[PDB]
Design a protein around this ligand. Structure first.
Ligand SMILES: [Mg+2]
Lengths: 148, 79, 49, 1337, 50
RNA sequence: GCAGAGGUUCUAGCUACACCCUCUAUAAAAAACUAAGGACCACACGA
DNA sequence: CTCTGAATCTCTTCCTCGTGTGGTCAGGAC
DNA sequence: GTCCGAAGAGATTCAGAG
């Protein structure tokens, strides 16, 4: 039935045309299928998913977006990311990510002022989220100490 | 610009010592006043450090030699 | 959605794995432009003084 | 700044030391005034000031007044950040129990007080009294009594007897107990009380007591009398809309605790009657329980929106807790996300990047460059300039992204190839553009997939990204030696279209003057792309020490193949391109380039091969027309035949000739055969459909049907897939798995009927639901594995241990699954690998097995090398370098500092997505018949029958390589003798599938000694021949008469004496099991090797790997004997049967209550060996290790997990499993303390006792004896000496409580610990920093 | 206007989208066949019979 | 530019991450400029 | 009879990210 | 203005057999 409908129109029955190339202007060998597929357009556009953060908000735990990266918040260097990074051996990159790029507010602002000066130094500092954990597990009778 | 690091690691063949030595060299070339002993071609300090390594000019012991030479020249003008 | 001419062939890898390669003719004739209506609520609260 | 973390129990004095005040007001900040209340949970006076250098009042607003408490309001003028460090203590009106000890799994309060947890709860929650200092009265210090009993005891003694009630009573009991005296007394009775259950419990209690007295903490501190609070800023009031300021789900918990404490204080101030104060104190204790962990006891409290409150333990444990959400996975700045797409114009070290998000990323870099260049003076001016994105900003941005790698990252990253780096190129649009070839590693799908992008900032981090992250530096995947940067689907199709041949094409037979002339011919259209020609190539082989020869020669080749000869660098031969170049061919071509020319030419390849593949797949026009899918005209005839056969079978069943199951199996098999015939017809019509004109006569060759091009080349689509597309769909199963009798006759080209589509949807939805649940369970397993092997980091160039693994090719009955070539490639020999001729060291004991050595081994008849595996290493805190061989991701041995534990755990967990979760012995080919652990008996017939249980038939060739292997059942009759050379395709052995025959060792007459008729046996009627065959009755189901005596069949000679086995004095009596159908009578002459009786005779997916790595003993485990000797049934199955082993030399202590529900294949008179399956079933890993050694358990586990992985085709080198196993059995159990200090029942880390013994052997004093205890990873990771590593993983409450009571201290020295604390990880670029730090210490 | 990737058809077995493609081509063929005899004016009889 | 205040603007501007000048108890000749910000559960999904 | 074992109850963890939609969070009486 | 499933794994009870 579809073949006969094709043959009614002045169209090839095989359903394939010889699409000449747009740039080379040469015939495509192995004639290619051409037809009118009903292409939709899904709601998942890109301009509502093109996100990027330099430095914005912070939380009580000094995480950037915490609950919702829609408030101009950075990506989550998630649980598996630190494994996939330390598997290489990116100690400096990992230390960046989880101390000076995300958590160590003193170190974070110090490195910001450093980068705006051409120099690219880094200060480890103490991850403020680790200080939050320290205070929490210390607030329940279990004494915790950064003993040296 | 450059693409690979094999010609760099081959003489620092731990692939981790390379990172440390080229990092401190790029430090002395970026925050310090040292000029690249390898010609610069609009290239950042990292690839410049790699090029200085691949030319058989910058290595860990050479960096220590430069550091102690700077120390001697500093303490020579303090006496 | 809409419907437009479709040809099944690898065109210089731009449709490498599953990606579509729509022509500038689609955008030119305003074929797939979609209106999106956003809403910006704003309230006036009983603030003191 | 520090090097360790200390854990203890905060006594109610250091709580006051921490706390800067006592919270007395339940009120938080007022709704009317933002200022906090006088002494509320939020309070500037006893915490930090609300604003920096500003007190709560306006008295000292000016910063001038620094560090001075304001007299007017009693508030300091310190910076407000201190509101995150200050604490406050709640002075409980009465002591209250700590939940982390009461009603917990460790049950520390239970072991300590030696009370039932029920009774402790009863006294604490005020249900019943507990006595203290009973004295003269019958009640001791440890008794629990009800209120009526309390009245009676008060009658017994008015005051000397004391029964305090509530938590105060427990406090007093803890005070009265002295650890040291109790500890030594408990040791005293531990030395005598030999009851195993009592021994375990007493060892637990004594361990608690010792680790609690040696650690600096008293037992009174379990009962918290002074609760501290979180810093107010760590527990704030967030919003301003709707209900002004909402809560934090913890302020209300603290308010409830404060309110209960205040009401109790008021009652104590008013001396209320004891019943109401009991109620008040009980609900105070309950409120403290809810604060500690809302949900450890009873109805978790709630006053806000009918949901459990997020208690403090809630904020620590679980994913949502701080440890996982906020510590290991901190969201990062300088990051971005966008749906990604493909760009061929990019190189391999490059990635697309939108100008918008690149500008939003490198804003500090843009500011710095602008300030340097003078285009702005202040950060405000730079912000304005970049917000207007002037044209002076774009060319500066392209200046700052000259050599600045960015970390692309996919969200569900599994392997470390899931986050690489590229030099981003600034392009328009909103989508990051990923190079196609690096999507195979990423598992990128380009259907709306979003990849996070991260920017390293510090020049050390940028350089580290360039050296390690960048895609051109990690081409070799760490899972296997197969390269991961492989042309995936479209470029390979283009290359296949290029590198092919058709016997007639425009301009064929032309002779070419080089590949450049071939390109000129094709681009001019004179010659077809795949015409056959003769070209003049110039191959460049490297026979010298790195130099090339210019070998010029003609090659009968195709124009398309000649096109690719301009793409290969010099060092490759032409035969690598003279073929069709499918998928495997292209992957092998890339691998050959990597192993010959290095890495830079291989990147040049990757990029150029992608370019040419795309550029010629474009001109290919590789369509998919429906007419390209030819229906086999043969298929309809085959379907008619299948219909005739199924009709015949069905009508036969309509007469009852066949059974329902028989009809089912026959129709299934005939439909499967019809499907196979249809597949063969479809192929034989499709793969040669082109019948072309060969300058005259007619010739047919490989067809150019586009579907067959896309399938045969390996581009996209398998032979089974295209078969289910064009031919039959075969059959498909129901939900359970039993397939339909009526298959799917039609296919996808022609129409598919409704019922057929429903049957298809069955399997489709099955697979879809399975794959979603698979991704869930695989992610969980990957986390578990990477958290059990996180701390293993290579830290030594060599361990200096001769011990290794006797690695051999795997032959599990079939052919070789993993040949010795790819088995021991990249590993290091453990000992002197000799050659067949002895006294010839073919390989030194310390040489890496790279390509040359493994190639030399094959030609020189290798069968068994020894490799120094990681499980055989001895260095504490990580394996050595030579214990691990090559990193397998780079072209050399492992670098001293890599993190092989994480890479291996990822390489194991990554194929989880690819891993789903829902006779006779005939010889094959040439070789001999050799057997080990063999007890072959030559029967009188002359054939071979074997008494041994674990006797293995292996088909060794004329050289020695074990090509084929087969297990030999007990009593199986063999064709020829041991070592005999047989032909090929021959049958060599068989047996009775449901009959273990009782064979004979010496012929003679038989006497039914100890065989009572009717009771021990049944002369059951022979319903076929008449001569009744005896059935030996088991002692259980028999009558009460013969249960004392055991069945026996003793052989006798011509005189009737006891015939015995030569060597063992015990006679040749053959005991019988139950249901043993014996078809003989006493005094019947049999042969030496004749039968005597007749006795009648589970997951393979991701759960199998989980069960393996969890060391789960199966529900039906095979039971083995821990000592070699004679088998016996000691007791008369009194409750359960018994097995006693009597070795000749050693003593005979053994008793095992084998459940009376197993087919114990071992009889009752056979000398079993230590580690023999007396029953049959899945051999549990624990007893495997404890009865056959570590080198056996590691071999078994790696073989089985690889079999699970090889079944799906995913390649994983065995080191990634051996390291997991080494981290899996790093725990020992002390068997003899010796001169050291280790309790017997103690289960302490293996490295600790190994170091202790290695330091004791420095003197003559003997060390300690141990037995390595294989622990499942989910609680092998939880048993580590470090405590934060286990705390992050799972069961945070359990591990934290155990660390607290033990006073444990963390000496980080680990990857996850340093990650949590944030310092450099001791694995990678930070390994040198950490080795320097440990050198300074 | 659009160039799909052919290699998504065999593996991701959705051969219907090619039947859809051919039928859409036939439908647009009918559309332009009547457009031609409607662009240049043809009487109602010829168009009606077609 | 480190502890405060004043200045020509615009209430207030002392490095608060923050932008110019003065001195240690006194307020103006002067153009580019300003704000340090926010939690927990259910649902549609997407890879 | 008391202790190796049968059971019993109970507790922790279950891809990791996003786009987002929302819903939610201490009064009247002295 | 201030205030009242499933899966396993382990800890814990019954029992049943010496
Ligand atoms: Mg995808």
């Amino acid at each position: 039935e579809i073949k006969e409908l094709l043959k009614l129109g002045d169209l090839p029955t095989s359903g394939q045309i010889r699409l000449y190339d747009g740039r080379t202007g040469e015939q495509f060998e192995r004639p290619v299928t051409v037809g009118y597929m009903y292409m939709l357009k899904l709601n998942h556009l890109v301009d509502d998913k093109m996100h990027a953060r330099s430095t914005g908000s912070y939380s009580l735990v000094t995480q950037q977006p915490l609950g919702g990266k829609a408030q101009f918040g950075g990506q989550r260097f998630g649980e598996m990311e630190v494994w996939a990074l330390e598997a290489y051996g990116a100690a400096y990159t990992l230390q960046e990510m989880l101390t000076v790029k995300s958590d160590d507010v003193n170190g974070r602002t110090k490195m910001y002022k450093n980068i705006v000066d051409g120099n690219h130094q880094m200060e480890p500092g103490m991850p403020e989220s680790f200080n939050v954990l320290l205070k929490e597990i210390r607030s329940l009778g279990i004494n915790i100490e950064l003993e040296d | 610009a450059r693409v690979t690091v094999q010609d760099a690691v081959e003489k620092i063949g731990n692939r981790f010592d390379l990172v440390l030595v080229a990092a401190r060299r790029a430090r002395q070339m970026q925050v310090g006043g040292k000029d690249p002993l390898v010609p610069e071609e609009n290239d950042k300090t990292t690839v410049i450090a790699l090029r200085e390594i691949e030319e058989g000019l910058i290595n860990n012991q050479i960096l220590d030699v430069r550091e102690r030479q700077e120390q001697q020249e500093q303490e020579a003008a303090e006496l | 959605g809409q419907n437009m001419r479709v040809a099944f062939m690898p065109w210089n890898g731009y449709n490498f794995e599953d990606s579509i390669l729509v022509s500038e003719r689609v955008v030119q004739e305003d074929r797939f432009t979609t209106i999106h209506i956003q809403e910006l609520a704003c309230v006036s609260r009983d603030t003191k003084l | 700044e520090f090097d360790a973390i200390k854990i203890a129990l905060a006594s109610p004095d250091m709580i006051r030391s921490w706390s800067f005040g006592e919270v007395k007001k339940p009120e938080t900040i007022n709704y009317r005034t933002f200022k906090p209340e006088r002494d509320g949970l939020f309070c500037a006076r006893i915490f930090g000031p609300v604003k920096d250098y500003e007190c709560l009042c306006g008295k000292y607003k000016r910063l001038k007044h620094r560090g001075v408490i304001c007299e007017k309001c009693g508030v300091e003028v310190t910076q407000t950040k201190v509101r995150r460090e200050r604490m406050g203590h709640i002075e409980l009106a009465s002591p209250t129990a700590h939940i982390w000890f009461l009603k917990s799994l460790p049950s520390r309060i239970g072991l300590l007080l030696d009370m039932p947890l029920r009774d402790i709860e009863r006294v604490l929650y005020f249900e019943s009294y507990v006595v203290i200092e009973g004295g003269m009265t019958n009640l001791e210090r440890q008794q629990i009594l009800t209120e009526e009993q309390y009245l009676d005891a008060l009658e017994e003694f008015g005051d000397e007897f004391d029964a305090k009630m509530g938590a105060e009573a427990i406090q007093a009991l803890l005070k009265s107990m002295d650890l040291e005296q109790e500890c030594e007394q408990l040791r005293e009775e531990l030395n005598e009380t030999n009851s195993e259950t009592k021994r375990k419990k007493l060892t637990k209690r004594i361990k608690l007591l010792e680790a609690f007295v040696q650690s600096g903490n008293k037992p009174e501190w379990m009962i918290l009398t002074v609760l501290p609070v979180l810093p107010p800023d760590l527990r704030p009031l967030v919003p301003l809309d709707g209900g002004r300021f909402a809560t934090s789900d913890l302020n209300d918990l603290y308010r409830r605790v404060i309110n209960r404490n205040n009401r109790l204080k008021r009652l104590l101030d008013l001396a209320a009657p004891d019943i109401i104060v009991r109620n008040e104190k009980r609900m105070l204790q309950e409120a403290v329980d809810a604060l500690l962990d809302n949900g450890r006891r009873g109805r978790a409290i709630t006053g806000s929106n009918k949901r459990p409150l997020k208690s403090l333990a809630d904020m620590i444990k679980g994913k949502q807790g701080r440890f996982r959400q906020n510590l290991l996975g901190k969201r990062v700045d300088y990051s971005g996300r966008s749906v990604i797409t493909v760009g061929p114009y990019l190189r391999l070290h490059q990635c697309g990047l939108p100008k918008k998000m690149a500008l939003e990323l490198f804003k500090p870099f843009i500011y710095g460059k602008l300030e340097l260049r003078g285009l702005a003076t202040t950060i405000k001016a730079a912000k304005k300039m970049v917000e207007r994105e002037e044209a002076v900003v774009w060319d500066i941005l392209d200046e700052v992204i000259r050599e600045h790698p960015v970390l692309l990252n996919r969200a569900p990253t599994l392997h470390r190839l899931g986050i690489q780096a590229f030099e981003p190129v600034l392009i328009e649009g909103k989508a990051i553009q990923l190079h196609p070839l690096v999507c195979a590693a990423y598992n990128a799908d380009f259907d709306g997939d979003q990849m996070a992008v991260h920017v390293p900032l510090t020049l050390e981090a940028q350089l580290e990204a360039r050296a390690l992250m960048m895609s051109t530096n990690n081409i070799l995947s760490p899972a296997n030696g197969e390269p991961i940067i492989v042309p995936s689907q479209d470029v390979v199709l283009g290359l296949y279209y290029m590198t092919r041949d058709c016997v007639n094409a425009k301009g064929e037979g032309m002779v070419l003057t080089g590949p450049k002339e071939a390109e000129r011919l094709y681009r001019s259209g004179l010659a077809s792309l795949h015409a056959r020609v003769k070209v003049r190539i110039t191959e460049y082989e490297k026979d010298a020490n790195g130099e090339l020869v210019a070998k010029t020669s003609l090659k009968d080749t195709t124009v398309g193949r000649a096109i690719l000869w301009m793409i290969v660098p010099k060092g490759l031969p032409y035969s690598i391109v003279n073929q069709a170049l499918g998928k495997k061919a292209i992957s092998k071509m890339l691998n050959t380039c990597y192993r010959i020319l290095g890495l830079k030419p291989t990147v040049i390849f990757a990029d150029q091969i992608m370019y040419t593949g795309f550029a010629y797949a474009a001109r290919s026009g590789a369509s998919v027309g429906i007419d390209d899918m030819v229906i086999p005209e043969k298929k309809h005839e085959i379907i008619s035949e299948a219909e005739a056969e199924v009709a015949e079978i069905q009508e036969q069943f309509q007469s009852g000739l066949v059974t329902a199951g028989e009809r089912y199996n026959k129709v299934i098999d005939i439909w499967a055969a019809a499907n196979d015939r249809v597949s063969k017809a479809m192929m034989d019509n499709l793969q040669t459909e082109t019948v072309i004109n060969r300058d005259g006569q007619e010739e047919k060759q490989v067809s150019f049907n586009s579907i067959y091009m896309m399938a045969d080349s390996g581009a996209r689509g398998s032979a089974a897939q295209i078969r289910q597309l064009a031919g039959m769909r075969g059959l498909m199963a129901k939900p359970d798995g039993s397939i339909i009798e009526t298959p799917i006759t039609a296919n996808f080209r022609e129409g598919l009927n409704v019922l057929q589509y429903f049957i298809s949807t069955h399997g489709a939805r099955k697979g879809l639901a399975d794959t979603a649940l698979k991704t869930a369970n695989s992610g969980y397993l990957t986390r578990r594995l990477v958290d059990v092997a996180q701390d293993l980091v290579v830290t030594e160039d060599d361990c200096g241990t001769h011990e290794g693994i006797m690695m051999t090719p795997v032959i599990e009955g079939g052919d070789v699954k993993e040949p010795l070539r790819d088995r021991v490639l990249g590993r290091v020999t453990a000992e002197d690998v000799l050659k067949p001729g002895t006294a010839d060291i073919l390989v030194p004991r310390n040489t890496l097995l790279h390509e040359q050595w493994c190639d030399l081994l094959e030609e020189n008849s290798v069968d068994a090398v020894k490799v120094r595996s990681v499980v055989s290493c001895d260095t504490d805190f990580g394996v050595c370098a030579h214990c691990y061989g090559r990193d397998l991701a780079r072209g050399h041995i492992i670098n001293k500092g890599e993190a092989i534990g994480v890479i291996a755990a990822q390489s194991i967990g990554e194929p989880g997505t690819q891993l789903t979760m829902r006779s006779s012995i005939q010889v094959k080919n040439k070789g001999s018949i050799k057997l080990s652990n063999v007890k072959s008996v030559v029967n009188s017939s002359g054939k071979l029958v074997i008494t041994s249980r674990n006797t293995e038939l292996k088909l060794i060739d004329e050289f020695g390589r074990t090509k084929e292997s087969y297990k030999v059942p007990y009593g199986a009759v063999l064709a020829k003798g041991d070592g005999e050379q047989v032909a090929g395709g021959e049958t060599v052995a068989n047996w009775d599938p449901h009959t273990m025959p009782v064979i004979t060792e010496v012929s003679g007459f038989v006497r039914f000694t100890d065989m009572i008729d009717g009771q021990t046996i049944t002369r059951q009627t022979d319903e076929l021949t008449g001569l009744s065959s005896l059935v030996v009755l088991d002692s259980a189901e028999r009558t009460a008469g013969g249960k004392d005596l055991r069945p026996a069949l003793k052989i006798v000679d011509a005189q009737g004496n006891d015939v015995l086995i030569p060597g063992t004095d015990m006679p040749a009596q053959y005991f019988l099991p139950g249901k043993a159908i014996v078809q003989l009578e006493d005094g019947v002459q049999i042969s030496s090797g004749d039968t005597l009786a007749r006795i009648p005779q589970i997951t393979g997916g991701l759960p199998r790997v989980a069960d393996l790595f969890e060391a789960r003993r199966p529900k039906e485990p095979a039971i083995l004997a821990e000592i070699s000797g004679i088998v016996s049934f000691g007791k008369e199955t009194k409750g359960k049967r018994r097995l006693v082993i009597t070795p000749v030399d050693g003593s005979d202590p053994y008793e095992e209550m084998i459940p009376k529900w197993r087919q114990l294949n071992v009889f009752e008179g056979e000398r079993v060996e230590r580690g023999d399956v007396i029953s049959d079933g899945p051999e549990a890993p624990h007893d495997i290790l404890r009865l056959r050694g570590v080198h056996a358990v590691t071999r078994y586990i790696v073989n089985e997990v690889q079999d699970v992985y090889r079944l799906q085709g995913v390649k994983i080198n065995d080191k990634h499993i051996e390291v997991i196993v080494r981290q899996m059995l790093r725990k020992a159990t002390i068997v003899n303390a010796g001169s050291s200090d280790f309790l017997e029942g103690e289960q302490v880390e293996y490295s600790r006792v190994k170091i202790a013994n290695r330091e004791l052997e420095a003197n003559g004093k003997v060390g300690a004896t141990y037995s390595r205890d294989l622990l499942g990873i989910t609680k092998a990771s939880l048993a580590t000496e470090s405590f934060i590593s286990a705390a992050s993983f799972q069961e945070t409450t359990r591990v934290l409580t155990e660390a607290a009571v033990a006073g444990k201290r963390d000496e980080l020295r680990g990857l996850k610990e340093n990650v949590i604390v944030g310092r450099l990880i001791p694995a990678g670029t930070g390994y040198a920093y950490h080795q320097d730090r440990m050198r300074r210490r | 206007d659009i160039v799909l990737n052919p290699l998504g058809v065999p593996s991701r077995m959705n051969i219907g989208q090619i039947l859809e493609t051919h039928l859409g081509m036939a439908a647009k063929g009918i559309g332009d066949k009547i457009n031609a005899m409607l662009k240049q004016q043809q009487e109602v009889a010829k168009l009606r019979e077609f």
